[PDB]
Design a protein around this ligand. Sequence first.
Ligand code: NI
Ligand code: NI
Ligand code: NI
Ligand code: NI
Lengths: 148, 149, 149, 111, 112, 112
Amino acid sequence: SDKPVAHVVANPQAEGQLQWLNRANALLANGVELRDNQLVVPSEGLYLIYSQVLFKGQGCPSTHVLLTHTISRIAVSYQTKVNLLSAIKSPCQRETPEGAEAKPWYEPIYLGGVFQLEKGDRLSAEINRPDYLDFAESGQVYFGIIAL
Amino acid sequence: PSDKPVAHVVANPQAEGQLQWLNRANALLANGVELRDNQLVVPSEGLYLIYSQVLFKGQGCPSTHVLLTHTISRIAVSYQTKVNLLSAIKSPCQRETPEGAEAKPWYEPIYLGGVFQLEKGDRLSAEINRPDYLDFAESGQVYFGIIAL
Amino acid sequence: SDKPVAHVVANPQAEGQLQWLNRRANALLANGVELRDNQLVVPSEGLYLIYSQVLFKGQGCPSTHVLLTHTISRIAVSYQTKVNLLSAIKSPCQRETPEGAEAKPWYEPIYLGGVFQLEKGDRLSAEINRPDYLDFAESGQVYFGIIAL
Amino acid sequence: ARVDQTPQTITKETGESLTINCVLRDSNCGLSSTYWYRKKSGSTNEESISKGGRYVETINEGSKSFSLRINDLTVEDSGTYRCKLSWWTQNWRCSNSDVYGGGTVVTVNHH
Amino acid sequence: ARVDQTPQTITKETGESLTINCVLRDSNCGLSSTYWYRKKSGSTNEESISKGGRYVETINEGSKSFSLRINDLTVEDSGTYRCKLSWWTQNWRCSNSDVYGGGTVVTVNHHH
Amino acid sequence: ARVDQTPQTITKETGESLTINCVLRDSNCGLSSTYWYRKKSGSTNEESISKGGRYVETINEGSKSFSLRINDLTVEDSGTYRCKLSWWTQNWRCSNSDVYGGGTVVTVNHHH
Ligand code: NI
Ligand code: NI
Ligand code: NI
Ligand code: NI
């Protein structure tokens, strides 16, 4: 295929940090680059952009936990960061009482949309709570684009 | 640029508790697709990726039941029948918030996406059942798009 | 269009089992993609958008922990090896439902989607771990599709 | 725009049960959050009635009516009871103000 | 198709703790909803055991076993205890009927 | 890392209220799980202080401070109170050890 395309996954060797990785069943071809943890657009066009992250906790803490995942666009020239896709989840309504059996929770977030991008645009896929990031299994955390 | 029929509309932030789609920056509506009667109108037969996301938010859990649905439906150009293409249901509240407790907001996004054969003149709708919990206060959270493949 | 494409839906006739069907309206299976052994068969090498949504439902929360998973996996044409492409886990039940209270059902959809390079003859599977909570009673809720881009 | 709480007076003896009913009239809003409060005889503070056990709340959303039954009454159950409606959980509130029923004076005696 | 509840008799003193164990045998079903009930000595009505605090339930799904530990026993804890299994939360139920353990007669005494 | 619990001693009378405050100092970690424990006067066992009713817990995440207020104090509320911080719910824990405040000895007396 000749379409600009990328599909990167979280580094399972990172320590509590969302760091994107290149290649099996991963893609980065036909001009797209991975630079500064961001995907770089090689040419103007319409792109499908998507991403999934997975959160996991052992229980619910005393502080209230809001999980966000956001895909943003940084113009090559204008140094403006604008949110393209974003979502928020709230896994914990009440704090877990002490002394009970560990009952972990899991919370995936999926984002996807079609956007017109310019050459040199930088796309970022970012979360707010790395202390609940779960990338222990393949197929769970990814970030991709493809020109349409 | 591209010549494919494409749309990407977002919720109107001035609407009051209502899901109204608008055509803004980082939004698309080109190559035949129109926005009419809060619906996307298909300009030509073909394969289309259809997708949408809505976000629901509440300050707590009420006494009455809260079932959140988001549905993309197709109205055929010829028979004007509404058929659900994509749908999902979420239930954020198992127990009513006890009195005297602090508001602990909850969030519930619903994402839908699929590929469908559409006909010229088809109208697509993206609708929710509980506008009183709709949350569109931030960009990138509520959107509705199509693109011909 | 000549693109390999599929969009299959859950069979509402199955008993607690995720069985895919093409013959439905607003469903697709064309240009080489085949459905065999409940799996989609890739007709040619290329980049494919792969997606799926499943819906879970329960009448209440049980005492045991309920982890809901949905996985799309790839079986290479040559080897009987299954490797996961896309997967997600959800945990709908934090607290057990007390007996004798309001039957208050819960719903939990899982959506998966990504772009992958597949080979001619690859077989794709979309599977869940808890068929005892599968809900396919309504159209547009459970689907599995691919399209070559 | 008005909550009709009935009956306004109830007199019972120990071991009986009672029912109070509230219905929302003249509103485009439906029932959202419902509450019941009690100010005991002699007390000057209202306490929230936790639903469950002796206290059973039933809700008919279609008719915008909801009721409280208290079983196995005791003398300590005497006081003034009031229902309260709120829409505070909604992101787009149907009404910014709560509405209260008119109140019920409950007296429980021995024998 | 059977729940083996053990032990059948327990005699303890004030302040001690006890453990009752139930195992689901001869079933193609796994554990789903578990409950504990108590009929106190002299009483003729079963009451539900609210899990938490003094009552600690442990579940082992792999062995289809679950147990109830009761700490800080009082004489009022004397009675007959019974576990119950149900599958009513499932959308496609493994079983249409519940199953109960055989019961445990618990006696709690004071010290000398 | 150090948790500054203040004040170290409190003397009140029945019906009054008190507040104990804990602040996480010298740590790159934020507040995660917070708990309060009480060892009553004469007793030698710690019990968890469940938030609600007479007990109101406040949390200020930005200042890493959290507080316990007890309203309508009774003589039985006399004892030693201690806060505890834990990070056990996190998937990537900020700290592998819990940390405790220094404690507060609370004395509640009658009005005469
Ligand atoms: Ni009497
Ligand atoms: Ni004794
Ligand atoms: Ni006094
Ligand atoms: Ni004095």
